[PDB]
């Protein structure tokens, strides 16, 4: 609110908090990003490196659906399915392993980052990382690819 702003305590001071030698003029340094190459060179090089110039190829008609591929990690892999699935699989004596369809959850690619608990799984995903697959194989499990 304007009650608590600084302008309420600036009344009585001639310059209104803007200086007496250099008055608060309209646009002493140009409009917007003016003179980035000329008189704002130091600021645009000390704080915006790479700002000037092009790089890379140009993709004219880019559609995000083609490149849409959310990823999940093995630490969160068990979080997708309910707790009772994991506890029953751990208690299970016949060696049956739960099947985790990460696609139904909404992740296409599985990346292996965290520690995977010692428990057989069947991860049914769309893509797999090399380390993710070898962790699943090492802990004991299967990887199923779906389209």
């Amino acid at each position: 609110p304007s009650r608590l702003r600084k302008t309420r305590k600036l009344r009585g001071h001639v310059s209104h908090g803007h200086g007496r030698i250099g008055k608060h003029r309209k646009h002493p340094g140009g409009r917007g990003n003016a003179g980035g190459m000329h008189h704002h060179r130091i600021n645009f090089d000390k704080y915006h490196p790479g700002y000037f110039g092009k790089v890379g190829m140009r993709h004219y008609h880019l559609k995000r659906n083609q490149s849409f591929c959310p990823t999940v990690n093995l630490d969160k892999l068990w979080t997708l399915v309910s707790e009772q699935t994991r506890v029953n699989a751990a208690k299970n004596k016949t060696g049956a392993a739960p099947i985790i369809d990460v696609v139904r959850s909404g992740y296409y690619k599985v990346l292996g980052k965290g520690k995977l608990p010692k428990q057989p799984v069947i991860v049914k995903a769309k893509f797999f990382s090399r380390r993710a697959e070898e962790k699943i194989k090492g802990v004991g499990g299967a990887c199923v690819l779906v389209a």
Binding site: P28, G29, G30, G32, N33, H40, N43, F44, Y47, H48, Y51, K63, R64, N65, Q66, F68, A89, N92, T94, G95, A96, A97, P98, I99, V103, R104, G106, P120, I122, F127, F128, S129, R130, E133, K137, G140, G141, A142, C143, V144, L145
Partner: protein
């Protein structure tokens, strides 16, 4: 004159934006107007569903949404002819029809036909003349029990198939997913060039042996 550190901004306010600005001060009034028109429509079609006709099961085109099922525009002609429903009577009984839909699959076509059969089973058709019932009209005792239904008729829900836990086989444990993915990528990329190399080799070896 930018400050010490911060973003570079390019606001789109250089035009005369104040001259063309839309304010939502009529948002609650428009909500009430929509609500009153919706209720007036609902009471106008006394026994017909408020949401209107029935729309088919449809899954979204793009890769991002091919795992989800949404509502369709209308039932395809091929689906209707399989179900034995005429294209001119379907709209009269309250079935959405659009002739532009194709059918490149089979399970989706069967699902729509099954839904159409269920809709005809659930539908209660009043006689055209109340005094004189006809062959296609519903019974008198079930006529009195007809009423509207709120929301869409037979809403489309994303049915999920769950499979029970199984024992992992040795072939599954020996399957190399990452190797299979990379090898498939390489084969797709280099399919044509290998073919032209084989053709060139054959067409050059034949000259050597001729």
């Amino acid at each position: 004159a930018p400050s010490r550190n911060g973003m570079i901004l390019k606001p789109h306010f250089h035009k005369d934006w104040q001259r063309r600005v839309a304010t939502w001060f009529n948002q609650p009034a428009r909500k009430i107007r929509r609500r009153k028109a919706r209720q007036a429509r609902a009471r106008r079609i006394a026994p017909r569903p408020a949401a209107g006709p029935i729309r088919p099961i449809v899954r979204c085109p793009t890769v991002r949404y091919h795992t989800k099922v949404r509502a369709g525009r209308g039932f395809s002609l091929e689906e209707l002819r399989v179900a034995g429903i005429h294209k001119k009577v379907a709209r009269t009984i309250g079935i959405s029809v659009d002739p532009r839909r194709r059918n490149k699959s089979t399970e989706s076509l069967q699902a729509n036909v099954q839904r159409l059969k269920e809709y005809r089973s659930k539908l209660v058709l009043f006689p055209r003349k109340p005094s004189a019932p006809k062959k296609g009209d519903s019974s008198a005792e079930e006529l009195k029990l007809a009423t509207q239904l709120t929301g869409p008729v037979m809403p489309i829900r994303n049915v999920f198939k769950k499979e029970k836990a199984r024992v992992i086989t040795e072939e599954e444990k020996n399957f190399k997913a990452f190797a299979s993915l990379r090898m498939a990528r390489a084969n797709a990329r280099l399919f044509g060039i290998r073919a032209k190399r084989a053709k060139e080799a054959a067409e050059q070896d034949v000259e050597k042996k001729k």
